[PDB]
Amino acid sequence: MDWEERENPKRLVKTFAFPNFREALDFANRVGALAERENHHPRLTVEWGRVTVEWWTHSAGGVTEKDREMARLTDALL
Amino acid sequence: DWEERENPKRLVKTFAFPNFREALDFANRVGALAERENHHPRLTVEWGRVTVEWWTHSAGGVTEKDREMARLTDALL
Numbered sequence: 001m002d003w004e005e006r007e008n009p010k011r012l013v014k015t016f017a018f019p020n021f022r023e024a025l026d027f028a029n030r031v032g033a034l035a036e037r038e039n040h041h042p043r044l045t046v047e048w049g050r051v052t053v054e055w056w057t058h059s060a061g062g063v064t065e066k067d068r069e070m071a072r073l074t075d076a077l078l
Numbered sequence: 079d080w081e082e083r084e085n086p087k088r089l090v091k092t093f094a095f096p097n098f099r100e101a102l103d104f105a106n107r108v109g110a111l112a113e114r115e116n117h118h119p120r121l122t123v124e125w126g127r128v129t130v131e132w133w134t135h136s137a138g139g140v141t142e143k144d145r146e147m148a149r150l151t152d153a154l155l
Contacts, residue, residue, distance in 0.1 A: 021118045025109040028123070032102040041098045043124040046105065048135070058125070 003055075003071045010063050011043075011056035012071045021048040030077050038073065040066050080132075080148045087140045088120075088133035089148045093155075098125045107154050115150075117143050 003012040018024040028046045031053055035041045045052035053074055055067040080089040095101040105123045108130055112118045122129040130151055132144040 021109070022113055025106065025121075029102065029106070032098070032123070036099055041125045043122065044102075045120065045122050046109070047120040048118045 005063075006054075009056055009061055011054050012063060012067055013052065013054045014071070014074070016051045016053065018049050018051070021046075024049060024051045027051050027077075031074055034070070034073055034077065038066075038070060040070050042070065042074075082140075083131075086133055086138050088131050089140060089144050090129065090131045091148065091151070092127055092129045094127050096126065098123075101126060101128045104128050104154070108151055111147070111150055111154070115143075115147060117147055119147065119151075 003014045005011075006013050016024075016027055018027065024046050028044050028051045031042060031044060031051070043054040055070045056062060057064040057067055080091045082088070083090050093104055095104065101123050105121050105128045108119060108121060108128070117134075120131040132147050133139060134141040134144060
């Protein structure tokens with residue numbers, strides 16, 4: 001579904017689920033490679049069975065068009 | 079010397095870096111350690127920082143394995 005919109009700070013959030021820890025870390029690495037390609041970085045939370053990806057522009061204190069674009073590119077990884 | 083947070087009780091420490099790529103590289107080393115030991119942390123990776131949290135889910139708190147994993151994490155440095 002659509003990315004969640006959390007607050008303080010405003011940011012786009014989505015969780016991706018996995019059967020273990022290694023696959024979650026592997027996916028986080030794909031998101032990280034995407035971040036490096038686009039030069040816009042997320043906050044990633046990796047744990048057994050899940051990766052939480054959060055997109056927001058730090059220098060802006062909130063969400064910008066780039067964040068929405070990164071969210072879409074993250075979905076396109078699958 | 080790791081910080082101890084609550085709800086749930088867990089060991090926490092943040093490692094800093096000059097960028098994002100190096101932070102993720104470090105998180106992967108912690109992840110490899112976790113996979114070999116079969117005990118998993120909660121890792122938070124962002125520009126300039128990796129937060130590592132150790133605790134036992136089956137117990138909903140800290141157990142001896144967590145203290146060891148914390149020391150092994152520091153050893154990576």
